[PDB]
Design a protein around this ligand. Structure first.
Ligand SMILES: Nc1nc2c(ncn2[C@@H]2O[C@@H]3COP(=O)(O)O[C@H]4[C@@H](O)[C@H](n5cnc6c(=O)[nH]c(N)nc65)O[C@@H]4COP(=O)(O)O[C@H]3[C@H]2O)c(=O)[nH]1
Lengths: 306, 307, 306, 306, 306
């Protein structure tokens, strides 16, 4: 599991990037250099980099001098432009504050560009005692670690569903419950409520049917929550008021990942499952982060995995 | 049994095709190179190619270099275009997601086309120790094994029967049964139901009569299932588990389809006709079990078994 | 749990070793060429060939033209010396009717060498279209098939222990039981009897204690059958008598494995388990073959697994 | 708290040592090069090597070209002299099947050192693109992983104490208790019995006092069973009997640990605790391995933590 | 018998090694040089060294000048390195305070290295009139004679087993006996006791059986002693209270010896007997040194040999 990190080179930036690969791998980061195992069918790294978004999460770049003077290329000509095309495409397919890079001293790229620092580091044939790259890597580990728990992906189709679900259902039900004296559900009068959100492991095809069977199987009866339209939710019967729900909105991301890749294959494919897991984990992270923002939701709304 | 795989080389790469034959056969894949024994009565490989669809399931080829300059041929002239003619006709008769290829480093064939990646390998006269071709064969096996369990054959006459059967009968009765409180079947009230589908080994001649004589001897009583839209006639066994049974009545469709697929001029059943029956039935089983494992109303309550 | 074949070849004739490995593996024959990961510990092929007698069952060698004409050699001063040395040491550690060979049609090694007619083949590029070599491999395969249940001819101590066990306990017990109606057996008549033999699933240090524990688990008494000295075995309390006994002589073969495998290693190794299981399989095969060969014990003794 | 490995190199080959520790820690082996903060109290690498006979488990070292050709050296008159003397000290204090060696393509070290296959590598700049070095480190890793759970070779007194304890107490008591139905046990019958062995988490001087205190914590009475002399153990009052005992023989190993270190210092250090607990874990592993090798105790005794 | 010392010179200190051999013999220290008769099967001195620990007790190294300049070697190269590897591995197999050395005037070794003073001596072809090396052999003697009774060998299994024996058994029985007014042993009351320990001449196979067979034929009956766990011992009846015991802990060192040497060699060997005697004498020395230091053990616990 863990976060996927991608470092890019044309034909010579291999080992001075593999050092960062190994150090990040020491921190349980599945960092895949551009030629480990995924990109073997892909003849070039450009067709891989055009698929880095929402597939290889964060990324780093390393460039040196040995591929900066003169060389002929196969797919392109004047390969000296291929490195900067790679850098620009990688920075465009990830977004700012999510795509990092470094370069060698004397690399024909500016030290700073687009508000992202691109330090130039030394040669130091063996790098383990080069305590200038080391601080940068120690920093990047903790900066990325801050950006798994923080889902600043508002453009992504998962996060928009997450924020819509949170703000328009969880916030609404919690605000409605703090209106009448304590709680008015199914005749009996409760005192406190802890909302439960159950995110499925795999979405498959349709979500409403799964929610229906899941609620039927666990002996859960409907409730009325009045707020514009009153909300229908689910409560467990065994005054604690353990409210339960499954996000119905996940059908949107289900269809999105179905259409995202050319799918002429009945049933679930491993790539489809991996994309499913990525989108759902980002949805879960965004939902938790929004939950941890509002004071009325600090502790009264919990999300669990089943 | 197992999957059937085809490999195609013109007249000089047959050795590196035999190597892939051996490696696939080590993974329980039945592999028939285009000159094993079946195609000997066939005068050329092109009739075998026009008889490869729905018969050899998946397909592969190996592209070479030593037959790429000039040579005279019997059926054709300028045989040097037959490598790409093979690669085109073979991706035609089998379709995408059912045809693969491997090619030499720098071979005179397209690097990629039609969404089918064609990985490259070098000659390596020490073939068994080339950890580039072996990786390609390993991942081709891993790709294939993901396509036995998932039947992407919507054009096939069996997969459409599977989709129709599921969507119009199994999903329909599953939706109908989750309408009334627990169960209302023949007056008596059970709690939960287990739909069971029985796919025969062979379809014989007619399916309705086979169902009638199967359920006359196993002593199962009929039931009325009323959906929102015509009621679905099913049968529930009497011995509170509600084990509903049914056999796909529509398998006679695929029986007739593969009777008309091949020229059947002989009365009675035939070995090749049996092979086509088994192929279509296993594809139907795969498609139905995949559609069952999709919808949550069907994953558990509906099970397909072999009688 | 299948037969193992060791294929030995020079560093330049490894292609034929690989091809024969594939051909034998097509018959469910676990084949280990001298260059697998198991032999990375050992330094040279001579060390791995020295202990091939019991570790690797049968074997086969391939001698090629490129390692038989000119090379400087490392262990010896001449590869021409080397190849005949490995052939000799292999044919010595395995002996007659337990080792074969192959070589090029033009090799100076003669066809018949103290037995086992050594066939010929040609360097025909890719070998999947050689009828001669394939026919050779096929009759080799049928040879191992016909000599896997025959047993041994004075080989590893499993067979001699099996012969001793049968001819000194089983036959004498059965003769004693048939010499008169099986009436007494501690005062209760039984008519027919069954003598069940239970092979311990692994050689576990001292073996009589294991038999005592296993028999005590089933609440099994001791009977007193008379034959020179009376023989004592177990009964399992009268239409058909049932009698049990566990091979106690396997302690000797376990201790023999202990000596053969030099061990300052305090514990069990995968190598020790492999040798133990192979030698128990040999003992079991010898015993079953020899009990179905005879007439008194054709049907009245059953060998099973615990 | 895992396996530990010590890697030593000259002041210039520290690059190779760093790469090897990277490779080993990628395969879950805690590796300490001589340059760490642990060896600051020691003066020279020879004095760090002074106590590596048992402190740092397995060890491997590296020699290069120009730390083995010409230099002045500080401790000796020649760096070649220093490297060969240091390798001699390591190979002596570690021995066979517990040490390994790597050396540069031009190194003058012999390919054989009274055994132990010496691999061979080169200065290929950054070491993440070295196939042969990676494979040899991988075989080392597999050897270490398949070797750490076996036992010892007459090494630190943990293994000899384990063998003595088992073969003089556990086997004797188990054999005496299975020699007859466990009926008496001070006048009350139990049939089956369980012989629970508790390993103390840490060694604190005298251990029989610790045993008495711990047994009194559970209100345990003493029993007497006859076997030479009657062996007295503790019971835990009856379908299945249960017996307890913690190794009293650990007093000898604790005193050995105290004597092997300085006397003037009072109070335990982190180093003492680490070495002590490591060797205690070794004793526990040896005991459980020997138990699963034996017959009576395979399923009838339990070794657990206090 | 007496102390055994191994001395090492490569090819030019042979006369210088024989002189130190003679001067150690003058103090009755049996000296085996590396090529008397034992090491004839060993092709090189390196495989002689790989068994020098615990077999040849002490050690002395002799350094010569004509073996320091230049000479091609067989097992190594640049015998300048081979002698130093010798001096390092010999120190690694014996350690500090158990390994001494002598070096020629101007020899390329430190004057003081690793806590071993390496004294200087010139050639002096007539060695018997050299009052420099005679004085140094004298101080070697007065160092060694202090180190037979003092067994500071806490690493060696014999010493740790002895420490365990004393501290866990003899101290406990002495403390229990000096508790009630005079004596309460088998009902009868005595006044003073002489506990006695019978060190076996040979490790046999299991000291349990030897203990029973020895105590049965002296008509010695068991005694009950109460201290955690009670103590069972042996007392003779013919008020002197001669209690008896036999060290049962010697089983561990036994199995350690027969596992230390690879044993496919059934039966005892001269090497086995030599290790036997060395381990037994070390155990007896350690126990008798621990006994006289204490006050409760100096007088009432005597060690005897049958
Ligand atoms: N609760 C209990 N445990 C037992 C008994 N006998 C042996 N053990 C356990 O087995 C350890 C080693 O026993 P050993 O090899 O026979 O060698 C033993 C033995 O030769 C002797 N020894 C120890 N305890 C006794 C004893 O209670 N009676 C006698 N006669 N000798 C003893 O000292 C050696 C080391 O003893 P330890 O350090 O104590 O460690 C002992 C102890 O943990 C017993 O009667 N009761």
């Amino acid at each position: 599991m863990r976060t996927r990190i991608f470092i890019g080179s044309s034909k010579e930036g291999l080992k001075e990037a593999n050092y960062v690969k190994s150090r990040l791998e020491k921190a349980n980061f599945e960092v895949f250099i551009w030629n480990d195992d995924i990109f073997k069918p892909n003849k070039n790294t450009l067709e891989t980099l055009l698929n880095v978004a929402s597939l290889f999460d964060f990324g780093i770049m390393i460039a040196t001098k040995d591929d900066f003077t003169a060389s002929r290329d196969d797919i392109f000509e004047t390969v000296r432009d291929n490195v900067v095309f790679e850098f620009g495409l990688f920075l465009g397919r990830l977004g700012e504050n999510r795509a990092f890079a470094l370069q060698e001293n004397g690399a024909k790229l500016p030290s700073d560009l687009l508000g992202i620092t691109i330090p130039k580091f030394e040669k130091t044939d063996d790098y383990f005692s080069n305590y200038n790259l080391n601080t940068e890597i120690d920093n990047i580990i903790k900066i990325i670690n801050e950006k798994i728990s923080l889902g600043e992906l508002g453009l992504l189709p998962s996060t928009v569903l997450a924020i819509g679900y949170y703000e328009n259902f969880v916030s609404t039900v919690c605000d409605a419950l703090h209106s009448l004296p304590t709680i008015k559900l199914n005749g009996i009068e409760y005192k406190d409520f802890v909302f439960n959100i159950i995110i499925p492991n795999d979405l498959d095809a349709d979500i409403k049917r799964r929610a229906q069977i899941y609620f039927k199987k666990m002996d859960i009866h409907e409730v009325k929550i009045d707020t514009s339209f009153p909300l229908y939710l689910q409560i467990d019967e065994e005054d604690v008021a353990v409210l339960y729900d499954m996000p119905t909105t996940l059908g949107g991301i289900d269809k999105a990942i179905e259409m995202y890749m050319k799918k002429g294959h009945i049933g679930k494919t491993s790539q489809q499952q991996l994309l499913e897991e990525r989108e759902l984990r980002n949805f879960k992270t965004t939902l938790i982060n929004l939950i941890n923002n509002n004071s009325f939701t600090k502790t009264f709304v919990k999300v669990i995995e089943e």
